[PDB]
Design an enzyme around this catalytic site. Structure first.
Site, mmCIF file in Angstrom:
data_model
loop_
_atom_site.group_PDB
_atom_site.id
_atom_site.type_symbol
_atom_site.label_atom_id
_atom_site.label_comp_id
_atom_site.label_asym_id
_atom_site.label_seq_id
_atom_site.Cartn_x
_atom_site.Cartn_y
_atom_site.Cartn_z
ATOM 1 N N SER A 135 -3.279 4.003 1.777
ATOM 2 C CA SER A 135 -3.876 2.720 1.391
ATOM 3 C C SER A 135 -5.195 2.416 2.066
ATOM 4 C CB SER A 135 -2.868 1.592 1.592
ATOM 5 O OG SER A 135 -1.884 1.643 0.579
ATOM 6 N N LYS A 165 -7.796 1.855 -0.446
ATOM 7 C CA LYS A 165 -8.015 0.567 -1.097
ATOM 8 C C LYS A 165 -9.359 -0.059 -0.738
ATOM 9 C CE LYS A 165 -3.093 -0.339 -2.054
ATOM 10 N NZ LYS A 165 -2.854 1.153 -2.084
ATOM 11 N N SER A 217 -0.914 -4.384 0.650
ATOM 12 C CA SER A 217 -1.056 -3.022 0.139
ATOM 13 C C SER A 217 -0.294 -2.841 -1.179
ATOM 14 C CB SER A 217 -0.601 -1.962 1.158
ATOM 15 O OG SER A 217 -1.337 -2.008 2.366
ATOM 16 N N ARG A 221 0.807 1.403 14.817
ATOM 17 C CA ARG A 221 -0.579 1.642 14.433
ATOM 18 C C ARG A 221 -1.487 0.612 15.098
ATOM 19 N NH1 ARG A 221 0.481 1.615 8.067
ATOM 20 N NH2 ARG A 221 1.689 -0.157 8.855
#
Ligand SMILES: [Cl-]
Ligand SMILES: [Cl-]
Ligand SMILES: [Cl-]
Ligand SMILES: [Cl-]
Ligand SMILES: [Cl-]
Lengths: 242, 242
Positions: free
Chosen positions: B47, B50, B95, B227
């Site tokens: 993603s 995106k 997402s 993350r």
């Protein structure tokens, strides 16, 4: 159309304060306030005027973009955050008068006044200009009039370029997390009685936007933080923010 | 030019993790990473794609603005946040694959691929397309290549309109407070071994910008929150955020 909600008054009285909060639910086209009369009472805008003055500076090219650096002149003024270099973002965050005074010198009183009228920003008052033309723009504005102006900005409907409106909305960014975004501007009209503090802007949620405009009596810069705190107590009561 | 800082490895090993963080100090034009080899290793973007796909959708007019509503089709998919109406802002925040799959159907594989190359976004891999063309764009990208792409976006230098770049930067907004703004995008390439999690973006400070790109081995969606956590531990160590 408007609805009065007097239960918000406790958020003011808990802090020995007097003022108004105005909310506008964009999806529902519905306004709410704790006091209808004060919602319509016009006050000097103080640094809330930095929102339209930034639009003007960008659209005339006095400010090229939000990255352009306005260097400190090396003169130590009373507010420490002013004694450093700024861009448009930081000049708005710290309400940096010397930077906006320079913008106004380049814009000029004639261009500034005409563009403010084109924004329908408040109204000229009987007292005319009471300080310098750039500090108050010769106008006074009510909380409900702040809402109407901010809704136009939100929708890119003001008579300046879309780009200028997008840059100013960026510069208004005040807080963001997983639950909301606040775009806003503080002000403190501290030179003339009655001294007034402001916070105006909006709260973006996933599925709605809530515009707000609050002002409060502010005889001293001691309760400045109550501008945001009282507003947030209203927003929490209304389940707009957690 | 680049500098390796192996002391960042503890933030990964504390969480029984392997990965890379890359930082770029914009004022100083200086890059830093915990592992130079992995910084240059290309992975499926998931993603994070995106970001460029939103630029393409806006610049071709598939998405008119960040307010346009992409209605839910009423089909209950596994990720609950997908089962509702979205705009570009919320589609990026959550997402939302079905929304971007619809964008890609309108864009087309030919236009998508050509515009990605014009962005110099990663590079095509020997494996070609390994899923659908919209999920990976036929490319793989390294952390350092993410940085280079993001720097162009930051400076409005990509070959799409300034407006499209400003709207995507708005949609990237993830966090903001008095100390910093984070504009970023997560990803999780979860279909093909090695499964990889990403977080890419930048931290705006008053006087500098720090670009970042991190990825990490992610065999399961259990450590997804690492993350951001690992990245923030690096940012805190470097005194970029408090
Ligand atoms: Cl006046
Ligand atoms: Cl503010
Ligand atoms: Cl591939
Ligand atoms: Cl923004
Ligand atoms: Cl993010």
């Amino acid at each position: 159309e408007w609805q009065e909600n007097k239960s918000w008054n406790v958020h003011f009285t808990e802090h020995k304060s007097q003022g108004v909060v105005v909310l506008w639910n964009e999806n529902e086209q519905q306004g709410f306030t704790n006091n209808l009369k004060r919602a319509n009472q016009a006050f000097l805008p103080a640094s809330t005027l930095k929102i339209p003055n930034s639009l003007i500076a960008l659209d005339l090219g006095v400010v090229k973009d939000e990255h352009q650096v306005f260097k400190w002149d090396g003169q130590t003024r009373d507010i420490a955050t002013w004694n450093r270099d700024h861009n448009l973002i930081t000049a708005m965050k710290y309400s940096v008068v010397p930077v906006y005074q320079e913008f106004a010198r380049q814009i000029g009183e004639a261009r500034m006044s005409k563009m403010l009228h084109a924004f329908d920003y408040g109204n000229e008052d009987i007292s005319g200009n009471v300080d310098s033309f750039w500090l108050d723009g010769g106008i006074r504005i009510s909380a409900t009039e702040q809402i109407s102006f901010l809704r136009k900005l939100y929708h890119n409907k003001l008579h300046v370029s879309e780009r200028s409106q997008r840059i100013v909305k960026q510069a208004m960014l005040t807080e963001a997390n997983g639950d909301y975004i606040i775009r806003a501007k503080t002000g403190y009209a501290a030179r003339i009685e009655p001294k007034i503090g402001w916070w105006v802007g909006w709260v973006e949620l996933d599925d709605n936007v809530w515009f707000f405009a609050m002002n409060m009596d502010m005889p001293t810069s001691d309760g400045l933080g109550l501008r945001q705190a009282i507003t947030k107590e209203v927003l929490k009561q209304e389940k707009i923010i957690p």
